[model samples]
Target: SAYVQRGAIITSDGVTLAESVKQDDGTYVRNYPHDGMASHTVGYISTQYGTAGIESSMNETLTRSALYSMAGINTTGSSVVLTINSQMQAVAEAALQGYSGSIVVMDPSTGAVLAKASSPSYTHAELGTSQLVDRTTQALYSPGSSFKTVTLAAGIDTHKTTLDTTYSAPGTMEIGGGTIHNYANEDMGTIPLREAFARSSNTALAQLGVALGADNLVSYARAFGYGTALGQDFSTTPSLMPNPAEMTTWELAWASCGLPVGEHASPAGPQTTVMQNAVIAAAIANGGVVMNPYIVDRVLSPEGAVVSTTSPKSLGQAVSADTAAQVREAMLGVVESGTGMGARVPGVKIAGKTGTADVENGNFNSFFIGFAPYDHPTLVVSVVIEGNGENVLGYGAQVGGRVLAQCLNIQAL
Candidate 1:
């Protein structure tokens, strides 16, 4: 009977997204306010289905204590306040209206998620596969060139490569006889490592991968939270990667360039959730500190009194500050004049990376991860626009830029 005294779940704006309703029969019913937004974050509660998501995660705090109930006090539990910005969420959802992937925006410094939206979302609660899954944190995809951020960071941190390091970024490289070319078979010629990074040259990255060796790359990858859960309030699947020890020479080459164990392998290389990519960008933006990403901001009593507050937590450092700075500068170069050019925001120093991966026959997944106001980073966004017949890189970049620019600078827009 104590479970009957459940509390409300509100957004940062103080408007409830989910609340307790009393029926004429004096029984209570849980209701979601938003038509379709925040469905995954505020999981529905039903007598038949038990609970999931925030409803379950915050069950203890949200339930009225027996002591309070015995005292005959107002039997209302605490309300969970989310860090999500309704406006930003609407903007992001609208931007990815027809897309099949997810978009996540957060404060790199604090890990306060501004928006987390998975497309093909539903409004009314039904115990279906779609509503049950939070794609941003659950479903995974091959990171493609975006994973180059990790490769570049590993190289710089290991001191095996520098921004000015030169490489002959030819169209292709042969590993154990199989020739691999830069995406689209385009030769970038002999260029500085920074240029290769900006161009996302596969040949150069593969060479760097070999030079860094599997040990260094795998170590750095773990430090960046790969193969580790993000520790969010709700359930989250960690990013996946191949064991360096098991990777063949050609496989290592593919892994370095983000092609990784292609479509046929069971445990492919460099698969990650979009939320994990956001953490990567956040680590770079936050000077190598990976702040724990969270949605709940606080818990408040029915009388508007605060019950609990969530503070910023460090998930530990992924790289040195200097290494993060170097990698960030190279990412900026990617946006200034490279494949990520479409992500540029006027008057803002944007650091970004673009990725394209062929999932299978004729279908490709597009990705872009970035942050803005480079001098003092504020917002970081990660987008994965799942498998499509056409090139989605441009669309991914454009959406990333728009979401950051518009939401971060909403007053001007």
Candidate 2:
């Protein structure tokens, strides 16, 4: 038998998330008040199934163990506090209702996870198998043009190419017996590297990758945090990338645009989580460093004594500030008059990139990563929708934009 009162979890705003109540029959039952609003994140506490998620992660704190008490902190069955703001979570869920994907919103400077919503949600009472998985960290997909940021970053950071560098985008390029073309083989003619990126010309990017070679492209990809974890405070999978040496000219060209071509498009390498995609924009927004993402703001004791706190931690520099600045300028153009116009937040200047990846089933995965108030970004958001049909451009940018607008509380700006 367990002491029911000791197992409880609360939010930062003093909302009771999970608690125990004694009934008239002198027995207690664990209940989740938020229902399934944060079911995957808050998890569920059960007498039979053990625990998972925060219920399991913060079990010690909720149970009032000696590890916390002996350390000069005491929680006499009050609750474990979480950093998640229910309001933001609700807003994200509401805005992302029709989508079947994930939304991750965070503070670019501090890496505080504001809202992580995974669609196709279920209620807490069910506690089923599929619903338990938090897709924001677990799900992975190819990033498409959103990954052009890495190619541009590598080119600038390594001094391999400049924004003004000229290239002829004749709609298609042939390499290693493979023909790579722009989206739908659309002819873009001759353009600068910056315009090519803003327009997301796959032909130009493919040639750029071939020009930079496999080694430099792979090196820059690694430096930008691919093939490594984002160091998130929760369960997360690192983005995967293949060795550049192993890639042929065709593979390298496709990889540069984030469309690592092969039979198994995802596993052949270059698959990324939504959070990993978010950090790309965050690093650019935060002047180059990728901060470690954290969920719990602080742990509180029963008497309000601080049991634990989370300080901002850095994952080191991903690129030079100058490189990040140049990318920011191009990303801003992505919103002003480029592919990301759907993501523009009225008066606010948003730096963003849109990605439409063709998956195995001939369907598409929609993706967008961006930051608002580009000059001094405070919020960064990444959204990915799976099986988005064929219209990824409109689906991804509009969904991502509306979610950002709601999350940032931007009615007009």
Candidate 3:
């Protein structure tokens, strides 16, 4: 009989939009991500039909079934005080100005989410269906370099690593004669762990993973709530894992690098997952504590009774507080002198990580996640852009930058 719930809630406008022009021009137009990014968190609503993202996930609390009795049945009215600062939420929302993607702003100190949004969003008229489901809460896609946060964070969490740790990142990492090439095929050369993360060196992260081995990395993944569905009263997905059969010290090296080789490539992808990527954002921003992420602050009864309220329930301290702090410092390094310049804010020290991935048969899913003030995090944010034009580039980074500068940053003012 526990009274705590955590994780995200999917939401939509509750309906899909109308069809595009039928001019028969045989033209292709991409307005937003192919799948709903975070619509599931807010619920989709439309003129035809409506569905809930967070609302459905919290059905027990909303409808008062498993979580509580009906309004007059047993409990009283209550409130769920969120850790998310409204100012941050506004900033996060405003950031979606012209882009079609998703944004999540949360507070690590209390697991209070300030903002969770999906944009380039289609309303009921745009979606063409009222029953469209939210994708960010469950839809699993490649998270690109963003996934590196976990691999790197794990390296630091154990005694196996230190801030000064250095690794080599040649231009291409070989696997069965097939090489895993870095961005633009650039050979970043050997570098320190902090620098590796700042520059987003694929070669360094993969090498670090291989040295740590697959077993240990997976153990860290589980601890950070990767493979497990955060029991947030919804049928959510779990993070994928490395193929156990492919768990060779050397093969793990490839797996750790995030490139599959030999039999390692045989296992296809992990289950539908989001937290795997989101948690990395948490790992980086929270200084090692992957707070149990949730939306509901408190669940109340009909008679003004607080049946349940979410607290700062941690999945696990993914790293030592010191390690978390170290990672935070390094992430700030990325913003200050790395590939994440778009995330920087004047006067407000910020650190972040960027992730870009191919959408299987589609374009790239560009992503960004991070927090402000290198030392103490006031807010953590994550962004994703589906089918981004021009190979999906670092579109999310731009969006993230705009979010903080215009949205959350102003709120801070």
Candidate 4:
């Protein structure tokens, strides 16, 4: 009876040894990422600094009041049931194993956020008020190419760019007395604007921005919900986008390239929820209409009454259906033959992108975002890694390929 004083549950698996409880159903309730890999998007909760993404974001809607309103007012909402398919989240997380990073998933039709994950994630499960830890939604860090999605979104919304439009890239573009170099420092000489995004090339996209200008970018960024809080009722904070006001040609080009001083500080710069980012990809996939992201499909109370629900909200049209289709094909090229090739999800049509950013030392951070059943997306996903310094993924698509395979079943899990 004295041993009962210490409530502990141990499984044969050492990883789940520390945190789990026996359920009344004669089973154990445990969380994935026992090794703590999902920290990038999930983030750790700190009693001291308050909470991060999972801690803050998921905590607020722990229950949905939208439908669970009691007597027409649900002071304590029911749980906001997420649209995320656990199998998808698991595959995404598994693909990111052995790396330090993050990932996000969402439904394109409704922009419902499915999975938001990151590595080296600080765990609130153990963190206390006295501890100082980092959180992603709260931590604004640098992201390399992920911002390209938003930048491209601006180009589409403004109607200044098209997928097939041609641009000449010479590896470096000198502007503002500075030169922006492509990722490999080897340009395609001349390629379509859409191809630029497919390759995640800085010079190409920067050039596109230069042609588009700062006002267009800022306006588009604003429209995309950047530089401001999303105004959701959740306790979480929105990620920051680079502010490109009053900048010159080169600076604008740089901003368009997804790099500005403030933006580089993001915990996972430029990267987005694969689900959400996949939605961005889907805007291109679904023809310019960037649907506002939502996760909680609906919530019901114990009384079987509707409590809360989330539906598709229009963020605004970012591109023409034609242009969106063009971009979709270009983006799909990334998965088919570009850096995102590792993201191929067999048994389903897929499109994808990848991003790798700065980590302390020479280590680099990696990002991967895409959608599945591309013709009519049922899922979109994004993945990122931190502290990878300069060690980018070898055939990022291949590194990312396993995830799609795991989640390849026709029906959503």
The number of the candidate with the highest TM-score is 1
Order candidates by lDDT, high to low.
1, 2, 3, 4
Candidate 4, residues 193-285, lDDT tens digits: the string is 777777788887887777777777766655555543431322224544444454566667767766653323333123233334444665665
| Candidate 1's TM-score | 0.92
Please give the distance, in angstroms, between residue 222's alpha carbon in candidate 1 and its true position after superposition.
1.1
For model 3, give the 10-residue run with minimal summed lDDT: 10-19
Output the worst ten-in-a-row residue range by lDDT, candidate 4.
1-10
Ranking by TM-score: 1, 2, 3, 4
Clashes of 1: 0
TM for every model, in the order presented, reads 0.92, 0.89, 0.75, 0.73
After superposition on all C-alphas, the RMSD of every candidate to the true structure, in Å, is 2.9, 4.0, 9.5, 7.8
Instruction: Give the Å error, residue 63, model 3.
Output: 3.8
Tens digit of per-residue lDDT, candidate 2, span 211-278: 88878877777666777766444666788777665778888888889886744334455678888888
The superposed Cα distance between candidate 1 and the true structure at residue 116, in angstroms, equals 0.5
Clashing pairs in 1: none
- Cα-lDDT of candidate 4: 0.55
TM-score of 3: 0.75
Model 3 Cα displacement at 87 (Å)?
5.5
| C-alpha lDDT score of every prediction, in listed order | 0.82, 0.77, 0.60, 0.55
